[PDB]
Structure formats: structure tokens, C-alpha cells
Design an enzyme around this catalytic site. Structure first.
Site, PDB file in Angstrom:
ATOM      1  N   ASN A 164      -3.679  -3.448  15.307  1.00  0.00           N
ATOM      2  CA  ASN A 164      -2.936  -2.228  15.464  1.00  0.00           C
ATOM      3  C   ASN A 164      -3.393  -0.896  14.386  1.00  0.00           C
ATOM      4  O   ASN A 164      -3.524  -0.043  14.860  1.00  0.00           O
ATOM      5  CB  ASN A 164      -1.304  -2.468  15.097  1.00  0.00           C
ATOM      6  CG  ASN A 164      -0.427  -3.124  16.371  1.00  0.00           C
ATOM      7  OD1 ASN A 164      -0.999  -2.799  17.501  1.00  0.00           O
ATOM      8  ND2 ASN A 164       0.564  -3.639  15.888  1.00  0.00           N
ATOM      9  N   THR A 188      -8.535  -0.764   4.322  1.00  0.00           N
ATOM     10  CA  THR A 188      -7.036  -1.103   4.145  1.00  0.00           C
ATOM     11  C   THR A 188      -6.691  -2.487   3.949  1.00  0.00           C
ATOM     12  O   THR A 188      -5.638  -2.932   3.870  1.00  0.00           O
ATOM     13  CB  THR A 188      -6.404  -0.568   5.490  1.00  0.00           C
ATOM     14  OG1 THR A 188      -6.731  -1.623   6.612  1.00  0.00           O
ATOM     15  CG2 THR A 188      -6.704   0.678   5.932  1.00  0.00           C
ATOM     16  N   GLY A 200      12.486  -7.379  12.469  1.00  0.00           N
ATOM     17  CA  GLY A 200      11.155  -7.681  12.421  1.00  0.00           C
ATOM     18  C   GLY A 200      10.422  -7.376  10.921  1.00  0.00           C
ATOM     19  O   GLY A 200       9.286  -7.380  10.981  1.00  0.00           O
ATOM     20  N   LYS A 256      -0.417  -5.140  -4.679  1.00  0.00           N
ATOM     21  CA  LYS A 256      -0.574  -3.715  -4.762  1.00  0.00           C
ATOM     22  C   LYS A 256      -0.691  -3.099  -6.215  1.00  0.00           C
ATOM     23  O   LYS A 256      -1.526  -2.268  -6.547  1.00  0.00           O
ATOM     24  CB  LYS A 256       0.364  -3.150  -3.864  1.00  0.00           C
ATOM     25  CG  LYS A 256       0.333  -3.247  -2.376  1.00  0.00           C
ATOM     26  CD  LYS A 256       1.590  -2.688  -1.506  1.00  0.00           C
ATOM     27  CE  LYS A 256       1.359  -2.980   0.077  1.00  0.00           C
ATOM     28  NZ  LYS A 256       2.630  -2.849   0.477  1.00  0.00           N
TER      29      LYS A 256
END
Lengths: 299, 300
Positions: free
Chosen positions: B10, B100, B182, B199
Site C-alpha cells: 500500500n 519508510t 483494524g 520510532k
């Protein structure tokens, strides 16, 4: 790289200090060749202003032939002068500009930036909006995204007074205290109007001037028992500033004191940034940030 | 300029779409020379993936000879492979990297960045932390000020659950709602604080500077024994951690609710906070697109 610093109140002095703290190797080669104020021209870098020559910024510009002008002078909203014609001349002469002076941008944004674009000249103006809190510079790191609307608190003085009022303090007492701390013309919403004008120009691409903005300020009579904020707003159709009661679920509810905040909405996302919107070191830091970015070739 | 796109789930599909939307003139000369997934190598830029060759990202890299690798592949936190090796090989070939994929940076930041700096290679990695919301890239416009500490909300799933618990919903009911939307699956791995720890590791490395890996982070997640609580990720010069903590009404993280993320950056000069939406394929792809534009501007 030689700077001409135009203006030298608290922001000009804070900037000079930041520059002497040697904060980035990008500024190693940077010196202040001259400082000009109402009182004349000082052709040296000194903590205290003592004029060496009589004369104005244009005379100083010719004498010094600086690579960069840093404008921290008082905003003249009547007609933007002499900063307005100064920027035009700087651009014509290939001299980059760093500014915290809103007037020329709020009156003539498109003219100045079009001229700069054509000449490859750079303008750093982070210091004009939200001081040292990335605003202008935040948009620089939001490339390829169309800003649809902006909404925020853009004036430290009125935010400070409205915050104190919400704690049961009188307008008069709050105003007194704001002044005691270094914050008619101070509370009528105009400062926020100039700031939203600049943002609307830069981020939305809507060519407007301070004359197109419907604004009003704060006063003693505002509703009691409501937390009020002076909201600045711009989208593709309208740009305004007005005091509004804010609810607890509003992101802007706890933006208090001299804190400022900007909600930027693009096609991809809505974001919010907040930080101090007043304080001379903070303003000077916005200019320093622009200077470093300039030296990186990133304006 | 020629990109090699590693991954086409995606995030990759969103990235390819954003690139084709003519969003900046900086991207005029940029083309995707090839896309690589688990199913092989497409040597063309098409919306629909159909492999032309079999083989892995290294075969594609050797074949295409890209100027930039864009890594949108899934994070492998076991050892960061194959992305970690790919980055080292790319860096040594003078090939810039936009990523990413958190794993290699959470595991071997100092190794990767030291190498890149030695070779003059640029790395865009905004997409790794708060997706499209400037974080990494926010720091890029805060020059000349030492970062003393950072604190944030770096995980949407736990923040959403905790947001519901503050409004009087049981942990069990809040988790169910999270699962319903979800946000969590075993929801164990979605609520254990690991994502936030990954992160904050990256942010600490980049903003504070001390070499830290995911192994050095003391992190815990949320569970039914919590009593407004937020899962706070924190880093300073001494330590890096993630833990649930109560937050005061005046704290700028107080209304950072739902799946929103936020980061507070504190320097000598000032503290600032940015908040955005935290996760989504388009958002992450936009972080990568932003990095690409900054790379084209020569501003990484």
C-alpha cells in the site's frame, strides 16, 4: 559573508548574540559589517549601538555592500517604507534578505516574491510569523502538498491577556502585566491580521494584503466564564481574525500564555505546530534559522 | 533521475501514485526504473505490478543502476535484512536512499549514517517516524540549537485505546473497538510499546546524537491494569524509554487523541510540538515524497 543589520532593539541584539555563540559551522564566515538604526550607521559589530556616521539604511547599504540584509526594524504598516524599497533594491543587486519585519510582506507579498523569484534571490521570513517556531519554514518541509486552510493563534500579547482573563483576572490587570513583561495598537487584532496575510500568501497562494482581512481585537467586555482565543483563519475564499470562545476538545484550547499555534490542513493531512510566539530571542532565532538555511542553499 | 522502488504494497502504490500527480517541478526528470517485490522485478513503471524477471532487490539494483533507492518494504526487526545490506551497498555505490522502513535505522543507525556521511550520500527517512508529519524533517528546519530532550506519542493504536479509557471505557471494550477498526489484530504485538520504541530510537539517534539501538530502549505497552494516560516515548542524552504516564491538562500532549501522533522537541531556546495523523499508506508515502523533493532541492 557580510551582513547589514537594519534595526537594533531587543531582537537585533538577541540576533547578534546568537551569531556570536557560533551555533553552526555554516555561519563561520559570517560577520556583521554594519548596523543601522534611527540614530545612524555603526560600521562595526558592537553589543551597544554607537553611531559612526549619520545616515539611513540606503546610505549604509551603498557603503557596506552587504551579501545579506537582515531586517529586524519596526514594522511600518502605513506604506512598508523604507524596508519595501530596500528589499526591491537588494533583490535588484542580488542581495538575499532575512526579515522579521512584516509590513513589506503584508502589503506587497506578490510583488516582492515575484521579483525575488525572477532574480534568483532568496528571502528568509520565518521570523515574521510565530517567531522561532517553524511556520514559514514548516511549509518548506511540506513540499508538493496544497494547503486548503490554516487556523491559529498568532499573537502572544493577546493570547497572554486572554489566558489571564480566563483565570479570573481583569483585562486592565492582564494588559498591565503583559506590558511589564515586554509585551490600543497592541490588542486590536492587527498583528495577527498581518501574520495570517503572510501565511495566506505563502501557503495558500492567495494574493491578498492586510486590506482584504476582516479583523477585530480583544477588549474589557468579552464574555465571562468562557475561554476565549483570538483566532486567525484563512482558506481559498476568506481570511479573518476574531476572538472566539473555544471548547475543551479544540486543539487550540490549551495554547496559553505567549504560546502560538498553527493548524495546517492539506490534501494529505491536518497538522498542528505550537511553540512560543513572542520573546526577542525566539524572533532572533527564526532569523538565525533562516540564515543557516540560506547558507545551506535551502531557502 | 532513476529510482528503484523496493516494495509495492500500500505504501509503494501510494508513492507511485503521488509521484504521477505532478506535485512538484523538482520531480520532472524523476522516473521509476523498476519496482521489486517478493514476486520479482518489474523493469517499468506501471500501476499494476507484473514481474518481468525473477530475482531479489540486489539483482534489480545491479540491473537498473538507480540513482536513488526508495525502500517502502516491510520492516524486519529481527536483523533489518535485506534492507540493511542494500543500504550499505547503495551507499558505497553513491546511491542515495529514501526509506519508510524503520528496522535498519532502529537497529543500526550509527553504522548506516556514519557510512553515508563518509561517502557524501544522502538519506531521507522522514517516513519512518510520524509518516507524513514533519518530524525528522522538522528538525532540519531547527538548525543551530542543541536538542536536550524529546517526548512524544508515537503509536496510533495505543493512543486510540488510551483515549477511550480516559473517557470511561474499559480497557477490554477499548481494545475491542480498536480491533473492530483494524488497529490491532493476539493484539499483543500492537500494544506492547515496540512501535513507539522503534520510532523514539530513530529520533534519539538523529536529534540527540548518541548511538542507540532498539535493544537500549526500556519500553512497556498498555494493559488492563491502567486506571488521562498517554504512552509517552522519551529520549534525552542519558536514556531512551517508552511508558504509559498520566498527563496534565496544560501539557501540550493532552489533546493528542485518537490515532494522532505528536512530538515535543526541547532545546536551550524553546520547546515546540508538532501533531499530525500518525499512520496510513498515503501519509507514509508522502513522507517519502517529501524526502525526494528535499533531495532534489539538495536539502538533505
Amino acid at each position: 559573508m557580510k551582513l547589514l543589520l537594519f534595526g537594533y532593539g531587543n531582537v537585533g541584539k538577541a540576533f547578534r548574540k546568537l551569531l556570536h555563540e557560533k551555533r553552526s559551522p555554516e555561519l563561520n564566515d559570517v560577520i556583521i559589517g554594519g548596523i543601522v538604526t534611527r540614530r545612524g550607521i555603526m560600521l562595526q559589530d558592537k553589543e551597544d549601538f554607537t553611531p559612526d556616521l549619520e545616515g539611513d539604511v540606503f546610505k549604509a547599504f551603498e557603503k557596506i555592500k552587504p551579501d545579506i540584509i537582515v531586517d529586524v526594524s519596526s514594522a511600518n504598516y502605513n506604506n512598508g517604507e523604507p524596508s519595501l524599497s530596500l528589499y526591491k533594491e537588494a533583490i535588484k543587486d542580488g542581495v538575499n534578505i532575512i526579515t522579521t519585519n512584516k509590513a513589506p510582506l503584508a502589503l506587497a507579498f506578490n510583488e516582492i516574491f515575484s521579483l525575488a523569484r525572477s532574480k534568483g534571490v532568496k528571502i528568509g521570513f520565518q521570523g515574521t510569523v510565530m517567531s522561532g517556531t517553524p511556520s514559514i519554514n514548516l511549509y518548506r518541509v511540506l513540499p508538493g502538498s496544497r494547503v486548503i486552510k490554516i487556523r491559529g493563534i498568532l499573537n502572544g500579547t493577546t493570547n497572554f491577556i486572554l489566558t489571564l482573563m480566563n483565570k479570573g483576572v481583569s483585562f486592565e490587570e492582564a494588559l498591565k502585566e503583559a506590558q511589564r513583561r515586554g509585551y490600543t495598537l497592541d490588542i486590536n487584532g492587527f498583528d495577527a491580521a498581518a501574520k495570517i496575510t503572510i501565511l495566506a500568501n505563502f501557503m495558500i497562494g492567495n494574493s491578498v494584503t492586510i486590506k482584504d482581512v476582516k479583523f477585530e481585537g480583544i477588549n474589557r467586555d468579552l464574555p465571562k466564564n468562557e475561554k476565549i482565543k483570538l483566532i486567525a483563519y484563512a482558506d481559498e475564499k476568506e481570511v479573518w481574525v476574531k476572538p472566539l470562545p473555544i471548547s475543551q476538545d479544540d486543539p487550540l484550547y490549551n495554547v496559553d500564555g505567549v504560546e502560538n499555534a498553527l493548524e495546517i490542513t492539506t490534501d494529505i493531512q491536518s497538522i498542528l505546530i505550537r511553540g512560543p510566539g513572542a520573546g526577542p530571542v525566539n524572533a532572533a532565532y527564526g532569523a538565525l534559522s533562516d540564515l543557516i538555511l540560506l547558507k545551506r542553499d535551502c531557502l
